Structures are given as C-alpha cells and as structure tokens.
DNA sequence: GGCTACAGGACTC
DNA sequence: CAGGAGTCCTGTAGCC
C-alpha cells in the first residue's frame, strides 16, 4: 500500500496570515481566552515564529507574553479554520476516493491505485502542495510511507512545508533508530514506563516478554507497537464518521454549587444541540473538569433520541451525580452527545 | 469467558 | 498557569 498523508502547516496560524498578510514574518499567537481574567487561557497553536522561542501549543497565554510580549494574539477563530480546512479537503478528494479526514488539521490519502511507485508518489506530492498553494495559498506538509503510521512520521520530519518519502528501507532503519518517543500515540507516560524497560526503540519490544509489556501498558498498546517492530502494521484509510459532538465551558468561579454551574452547563447543551445539526444522539455525558485538573464525568444512555429538553433535565441529574460522588471544586463544565441515530 | 455500560486514562491536534 | 474537541482502550461489575 502508498500512504500520502497531508499536514497543513501552523493551520489555524497561517489562515490568519492569508486572511492579513501583514502578519506574515511576525510571531502569530492564536488563544483561547477563557474569561476568568485578562490573557487567562491557553495558547492553541502559533506559527513558527512564535514556535521557534518556545511559544507552544498548550502553553498559558501569560506565559506565551513574558516570552514574546510583541508577538501578535489572536482569538480563535475556528469556524473560519473550519471552512478553509473543508475546502483544502475538498481539492485532496480529487486525488483519490480513499480518503481519510483525520482532523481539520490532516487527511490520509491512498493512492495505491494512482501511482505505481514512490517516484510517482512523490511527484503526486508535489502536485497536491502545489494545488493548495495555488487555490488557498496554503502551505502544506506530505508524508509518504506504506501505511499511516510511517507516512505521519514521515511529514513529521519534514514540516514545514515540506514532502517526505520513506520507503522500505528506512522502515526497518526506523524500526531500529527513531526514539520510540516519537511515534504516534506514545506520549510522556507511556514513554516514561516503556523506556524504564529499556524499551527506547520499536525493535526493543520484540525481544521483551510479551506478558510484560502488555503488563506495563496495556493490550492494544503492546500489539500496535510490536505490529509496527515488525513491520507488520496496517490499517485501512477510513472515512471518518464523527462519534460524539460536545462543548465544555470554563466557569468564571470554581463552584460546587447546583445552581450557579446550571447556567453553564445549560449554554454548553444548547451550543452542542447547535452543532449535532441533524443528528440525533442516544447517549449523554456530563463532563467536569475539577479544581485541580482532574476530569470527571458521568453518562447515560436511551432507548431512543434525547431531545434537547431531555439532555436539559438528565444534564442535572448527571451533574448532581458528580457533586454528590465528589467532593471536589469545578472548574469547567459540559456535555457531550453521542450514539447517534 | 466474554459481551455491555459506565467511568477513568492516555493521546492527538 | 493550566482551552477545547474528539477518539480509543481498560478496569470493574452485571449478566448469559
Ligand atoms: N494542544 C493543541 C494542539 C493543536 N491544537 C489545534 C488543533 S488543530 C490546530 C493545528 O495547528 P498546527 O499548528 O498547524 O498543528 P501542527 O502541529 O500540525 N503544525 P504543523 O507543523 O503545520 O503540522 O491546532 C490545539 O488546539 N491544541
Ligand atoms: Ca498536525
Ligand atoms: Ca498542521
Ligand atoms: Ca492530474
Ligand atoms: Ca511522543
């Protein structure tokens, strides 16, 4: 199989540069201001002249100022992403019928049955960066590999604005070299108790006790990891339907109390009844986020479709199960609908 | 034993 | 100093 997996470059960064290009050359900051307080919130995403002195994804807004007190901040301004984002699908979608939509942000393309080869994948590469920059004026990053995994990793190397190629060989020098870190869903704690087994590359996993890894981190985990060690990894390019639709809100105050919190958590219910569109949801989660961080949540599920004055009064319910199970503070509040109909 | 629901865990962008 | 949205997996408990 060919993989040629599309990563739009700082996205949600460039879109403001395209839609001001006095921006371009400057640090661009896009935040989610929360409310509680002047620059209270965190930073989303920043082109890679805010990124290239620290100023990253998740950081806080006040810490992103005292690094880049002249940079530019922005609010996000997703709806905007969006639409751009459904656009530059739409152009990849001529290349191929085998699409996948990974976020607003990537898209997987297989193009075994367009290109005979690496070459003419390549060359299809270009293509594609160009088409885009040519109709959005957006730069893009191509990943090409024999399945997603690699093909990710592969534009992770090469962004931004790049095109990537890694054919078989490199797999197997991967397989042996990259930092184990570096794949795809290995994050800060799987890492720690992977590499704390010695395990700091793909092939490590193949000479350990199975039992034991999967003892570590957990079934799933263990046979994706080893799959790839093996190069043995596949999984099919997908249509993506979406699972659940939610929205979660940050109180201006850490409460506790019923009737203080109802009002957020009743416009958290009537965005997200916005954006089922016209899909029907069975299944409802009241989601909380606690005094120090923590999430809680508690759900049910229906026989049939939950109407909007239905999540209403089952939204309490749930959340009364979460003062009532815990004595914690909240801090954010929301919902999220899924098992649509 | 394994399938279901539910709540938490971890990860991605 | 700590936003937002969405996905997949796992541990536990009821049930067949
Ligand atoms: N922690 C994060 C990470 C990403 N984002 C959003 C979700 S999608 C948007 C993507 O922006 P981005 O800077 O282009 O993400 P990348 O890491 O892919 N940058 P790139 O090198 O272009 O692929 O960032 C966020 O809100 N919070
Ligand atoms: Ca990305
Ligand atoms: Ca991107
Ligand atoms: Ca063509
Ligand atoms: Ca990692």
Avoid: W
Wanted: glycine share 4%; with cysteine; net charge positive.
């Amino acid at each position: 199989m060919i993989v040629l997996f599309v990563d739009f470059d700082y996205f949600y960064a460039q879109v403001e540069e395209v839609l001001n290009p006095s921006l371009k050359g400057k640090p661009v900051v896009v935040c989610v201001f929360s409310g509680r307080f002047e620059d209270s919130g965190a930073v989303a995403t920043a082109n890679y002249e805010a990124r290239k002195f620290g100023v990253k994804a998740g950081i806080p807004i006040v810490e992103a100022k005292k690094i880049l007190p002249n940079a530019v901040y922005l609010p996000m301004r997703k709806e905007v992403y969006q639409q751009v984002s459904s656009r530059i699908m739409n152009l990849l979608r001529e290349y191929s019928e085998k699409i996948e939509i990974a976020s607003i942000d990537e898209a997987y393309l297989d193009i075994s049955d367009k290109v005979r080869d690496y070459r003419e994948a390549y060359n299809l590469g270009l293509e594609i960066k160009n088409k885009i920059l040519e109709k959005e004026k957006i730069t893009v990053t191509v990943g090409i590999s024999k399945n997603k995994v690699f093909a990710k990793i592969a534009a992770d190397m090469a962004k931004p604005n790049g095109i990537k190629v890694i054919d078989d060989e490199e797999v197997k020098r991967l397989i042996r070299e990259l930092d184990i870190a570096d794949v795809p869903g290995i994050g800060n704690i799987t890492a720690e108790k992977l590499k704390k087994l010695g395990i700091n590359k793909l092939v490590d996993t193949l000479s350990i006790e199975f039992d034991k890894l999967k003892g570590m981190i957990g079934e799933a985990k263990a046979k994706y990891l080893i799959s790839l060690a093996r190069d043995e990894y596949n999984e099919p390019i997908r249509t993506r339907v979406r699972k659940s639709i939610g929205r979660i809100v940050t109180m201006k105050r850490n409460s506790r109390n019923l009737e203080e919190i109802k009002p957020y958590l009743f416009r958290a219910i009537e965005e997200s009844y916005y954006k089922l569109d016209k899909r029907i949801p069975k299944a409802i989660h009241v989601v909380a986020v606690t005094e120090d961080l923590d999430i809680v949540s508690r759900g049910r599920t229906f026989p049939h479709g939950i109407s909007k004055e239905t999540a209403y009064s089952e939204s309490v319910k749930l959340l009364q199960k979460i003062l009532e199970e815990d004595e914690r503070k909240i801090r954010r509040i929301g919902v999220r609908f899924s098992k649509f109909i």
